[PDB]
Amino acid sequence: QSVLTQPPSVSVSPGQTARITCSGDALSTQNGNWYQQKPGQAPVMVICKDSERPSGIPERFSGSRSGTTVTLTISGVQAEDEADYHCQSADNRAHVVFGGGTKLTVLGQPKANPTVTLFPPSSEELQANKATLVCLISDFYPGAVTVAWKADSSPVKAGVETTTPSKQSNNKYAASSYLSLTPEQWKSHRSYSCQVTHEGSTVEKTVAPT
Amino acid sequence: VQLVESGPGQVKPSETLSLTCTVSGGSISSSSYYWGWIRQPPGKGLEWIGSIYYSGSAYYNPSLKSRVTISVDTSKNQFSLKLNSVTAADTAVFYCARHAAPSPGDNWFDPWGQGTLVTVSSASTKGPSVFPLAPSSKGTAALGCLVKDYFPEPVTVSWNSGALTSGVHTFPAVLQSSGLYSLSSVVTVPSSSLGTQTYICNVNHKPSNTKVDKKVEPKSC
Amino acid sequence: NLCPFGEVFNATRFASVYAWNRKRISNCVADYSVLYNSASFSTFKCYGVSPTKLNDLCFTNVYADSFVIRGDEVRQIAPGQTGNIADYNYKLPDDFTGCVIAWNSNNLDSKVGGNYNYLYRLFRKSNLKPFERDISTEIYQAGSTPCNGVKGFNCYFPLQSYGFQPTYGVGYQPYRVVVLSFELLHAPATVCGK
Structure with a gap:
């Protein structure tokens, strides 16, 4: 058993070189493979045997390997590239696994940090014997965010539903994440937190039952 | 191939x-x-x-x-x-x-x-439950409406019967593991108007003939 | 009666190359017509004796060694070879007198998802001597580091799996190898050709 780890977001200006890394204990006895997936399209293979180019792949793409980490290097990144890129491998026990996915964004408009708003369960929802935390994220560029939930200061994973980043009016992006709780869980902890991370930066909001 | x-x-x-x-x-x-x-x-x-x-x-x-x-x-x-x-x-x-x-x-x-x-999804056609998202007691503030557990897409949301359009952001919906969708709409207004202006969200779900007008007021502690 | 070559060549399962099998054949009449006359053998090299001449000689003991290696390693089952197989798993002597037989067994020894039953010794301190079989599973140490049977640093497992899968290249596909050693000992002739 293993997990392939890759960052969720990489931004580059036109013409520069983007570098995506992918690591894991698996990558010992294992090669790596890179796929590009455009919105609403099947993935396309870009790199064979860690570092090789198939026929339809232009020379601007290159792959490198370093210990337990492989690197997909795109030189002269143009607008034709913006997509989600995926690494892949398959251990001794024949376990064929994917990474989480990296969204490339060609920084046309300047980097925009997300604005995060966190709502507690309304008094009306509690009286219907339910509880929903509403965390809303908007006005970020590039359009790739990751959301972490916290009970007091402990991670929460169950009952989390999060949208994909979606392009909004001003070419920035928007997203939302929901936590479903029983009113007992909501009133048990002193506070819940919504942690949004955007390109290394992290914005956190917190609400309490009052 | x-x-x-x-x-x-x-x-x-x-x-x-x-x-x-x-x-x-x-x-x-x-x-x-x-x-x-x-x-x-x-x-x-x-x-x-x-x-x-x-x-x-x-x-x-x-x-x-x-x-x-x-x-x-x-x-x-x-x-x-x-x-x-x-x-x-x-x-x-x-x-x-x-x-x-x-x-x-x-x-x-x-x-x-x-x-x-x-x-x-065993998601049969279902109208949404609408809950107010009160503005927090703590120069601008955000208030909105939680549109919860409906199927199928979509729903339309306006504010004050469309008279309020500036500052409105209706987010795309999640697809829960109940098979039902849920969506939120928020409007950002100056904090000085939370006590002098009424805010009502108008939710329309055509597949269920649902229409809910929910007034959003600050939460009373 | 006849010599039981069928029990070795037509055996349903072979041994890993590190623990290669040895069948001692004695007191029987052998026919080397049928062997060279098959067409399923991809390698058939004889050293020190012609394959058609074996029907005329008498030996004292004929040894049949059988195991499984991948296709690219078949070249190492020969006198005076080096490599992981020739040095650590199965060494033939430099004056080897016999024949080496091998055939593609991909239909038999490879599994979807990998057949991890066939192993080979990857680590050893000094080279195997001719016809030596090392079946040790002791954790190889390169230096002096505490570990206690825990695969850590300077403390790894010496055997390694092939993981034969059917979509592999023929260089990585399993090959069944039978090594016929003809020991013309000074003694009573037990195995003659006819």
Whole structure:
């Protein structure tokens, strides 16, 4: 058993070189493979045997390997590239696994940090014997965010539903994440937190039952 | 080489999901390539299901191993996929790709199929519950309306009967594992107007003839 | 009666190359017509004796060694070879008198997802001497580091799996090898050709 780890977001200006890394204990006895997936399209293979180019792949793409980490290097990144890129491998026990996915964004408009708003369960929802935390994220560029939930200061994973980043009016992006709780869980902890991370930066909001 | 998916686009919860992939550019009976299934939930990462060979043996995920089985048919040049006891975390787009295994660690998917989206939901048509999102007591403030547990898409939201349009942001909806959607709409106003201006959200769900007008007021502690 | 070559060549399962099998054949009449006359053998090289001449000689003991290696390693089963197989798993002597037979067994020894039953010794301190069989599973140490049977640093497992899968290249596909050693000992002739 293993997990392939890759960052969720990489931004580059036109013409520069983007570098995506992918690591894991698996990558010992294992090669790596890179796929590009455009919105609403099947993935396309870009790199064979860690570092090789198939026929339809232009020379601007290159792959490198370093210990337990492989690197997909795109030189002269143009607008034709913006997509989600995926690494892949398959251990001794024949376990064929994917990474989480990296969204490339060609920084046309300047980097925009997300604005995060966190709502507690309304008094009306509690009286219907339910509880929903509403965390809303908007006005970020590039359009790739990751959301972490916290009970007091402990991670929460169950009952989390999060949208994909979606392009909004001003070419920035928007997203939302929901936590479903029983009113007992909501009133048990002193506070819940919504942690949004955007390109290394992290914005956190917190609400309490009052 | 081309790969085409086939099968029903809806599966109720806890059921068997059947899918059949048909290739048309080579031969599945070849002794150099596997035939797998890969899925990804909407806006999530990829996840390999299982790869099958022209014989019969195959290998699947550790997680999805008991409720998964794969078949092939060299005569019809197609392999299939069966997923027993489908929960609603299985809502994803299912691709069938072609798998190459030259040496012991070399394992890639050379040409992918376009993939079908199968949405698992016993989701019958249902109107939404509308709850106010009161502005926090702690120069601007955000208030909104929670539109919860409806099916199918979509719903329309306006504020003060469309008279208020500046500062409104209606977010795209989530697809819960109940099969039901949920959506939020917020309007940002100056903090000095929370006590002198009325804010009412107008929610319309045409499939259910639902229309709810919910006043949003600051929360009373 | 006849010599039981069928029990070795037509055996349903072979041994890993590190623990290669040895069948001692004695007190029987052998026919080397049928052997060279098959067409399923991809390698058939004889050293020190012609394959058609074996029907005329008498030996004291004929040894049949059988194991499984991948296709690219078949070249190492020969006198005066080096490599992981020739140095650590099965060494033939430099004056080897016999024939080496091998055939592609991909239909038999490879599994979808990998057949991890066939192993080979990857680590050893000094080279195997001719016809030596090392079956040790002791954790190889390169220096002096505490570990206690825990695969850590300077403390790894010496055997390694092939993981034969059917879509592999023929260089990585399983090959069944039978090594016929003809020991013309000074003694009573037990195995003659006819």
